[PDB]
Design an enzyme around this catalytic site. Structure first.
Site, PDB file in Angstrom:
ATOM      1  N   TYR A  76       0.830  -1.205   0.000  1.00  0.00           N
ATOM      2  CA  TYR A  76       0.000   0.000   0.000  1.00  0.00           C
ATOM      3  C   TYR A  76       0.863   1.253   0.000  1.00  0.00           C
ATOM      4  CZ  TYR A  76      -4.501  -2.297   0.760  1.00  0.00           C
ATOM      5  OH  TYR A  76      -5.672  -3.013   0.605  1.00  0.00           O
ATOM      6  N   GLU A  77       1.939   1.245   0.783  1.00  0.00           N
ATOM      7  CA  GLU A  77       2.830   2.407   0.798  1.00  0.00           C
ATOM      8  C   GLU A  77       3.477   2.601  -0.569  1.00  0.00           C
ATOM      9  OE1 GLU A  77       5.488   2.909   4.428  1.00  0.00           O
ATOM     10  OE2 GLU A  77       4.118   4.606   4.443  1.00  0.00           O
ATOM     11  N   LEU A  78       3.912   1.509  -1.206  1.00  0.00           N
ATOM     12  CA  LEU A  78       4.475   1.599  -2.552  1.00  0.00           C
ATOM     13  C   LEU A  78       3.469   2.173  -3.536  1.00  0.00           C
ATOM     14  CD1 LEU A  78       6.432  -1.577  -3.708  1.00  0.00           C
ATOM     15  CD2 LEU A  78       7.305   0.813  -3.785  1.00  0.00           C
TER      16      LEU A  78
ATOM     17  N   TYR B  76      -4.050   4.638   3.817  1.00  0.00           N
ATOM     18  CA  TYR B  76      -3.437   4.020   2.641  1.00  0.00           C
ATOM     19  C   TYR B  76      -4.434   3.130   1.915  1.00  0.00           C
ATOM     20  CZ  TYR B  76       1.374   5.481   3.556  1.00  0.00           C
ATOM     21  OH  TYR B  76       2.541   6.208   3.689  1.00  0.00           O
TER      22      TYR B  76
END
Lengths: 143, 143
Positions: A76-78, B76
């Site tokens: 998700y961060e990517l 996110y």
């Protein structure tokens, strides 16, 4: 002229190494870092959302390892950084990634790894000394 | 004709309520649900990435509460669904959200809440019975 030099993201598995080596060295050497474990304040109208660090940091730095690529949260961060952010990305390979382990739809990370644009950690002091100078160098480049 | 009726996302704080009430009722009643706590398999080439559930589910269902809106991880997840997904979104308000608590850049969730398009949980059995019929109804609508 952003207030932070870098927003840093890292997996739970890599948290001890990142705090004890990466974060400590960078902050001792004068870099200003934004990272959620310290700087995300739940409920705070400014500090309690995910856009704050990335919007106020010159670079985005990911600590890469199998634990990062296989983590649901890190994917998700990517996704977020890939769609929000370019030259502002900095990849630090802490541990080798098996080939084709990055999900196919993460095009940016895939092309960046394929094109060898990352910095790689090493256990050897001589390579580590070079690593730290090169990391400082890339943090100061334009976007 | 997706294999799952819904990909469901919920905060850690709401995990007990979601598993004991939402997930249990839906699965007992025949709905097929994809959710990461059970269905994300780290390292698995198909099941170990965040695109699997959403790409194979008819609807995306978020359980909303202050704990969701203020969670770094849930923000996110919201970003991902907002940018991946429309009529396929389903919002269940488990607990009221204070006004303007959703970060400004989450335009889709903001407009959807403003336009009252969500289903709201209630403690009263009569309103809960209606809730469950209406939830089944919205899960079966077209996209």
């Amino acid at each position: 002229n952003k207030p932070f030099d870098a927003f840093i993201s890292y997996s739970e598995h890599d948290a001890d190494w990142t705090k004890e080596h990466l974060l400590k060295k960078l902050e001792t050497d004068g870099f200003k870092i934004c990272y959620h474990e310290r700087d995300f304040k739940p409920g705070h109208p400014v500090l309690g959302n995910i856009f704050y660090c990335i919007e106020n940091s010159h670079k985005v730095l990911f600590v890469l390892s199998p634990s990062f690529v296989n983590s649901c949260w890190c994917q998700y961060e990517l996704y977020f950084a890939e769609h929000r952010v370019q030259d502002s990305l900095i990849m630090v390979v802490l541990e080798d990634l098996p080939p084709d382990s990055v999900p196919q739809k993460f095009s940016k990370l895939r092309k960046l790894l394929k094109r060898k644009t990352y910095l790689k950690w090493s256990p050897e002091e001589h390579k580590q000394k070079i690593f730290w100078h090169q990391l400082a160098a890339v943090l100061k480049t334009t976007n």
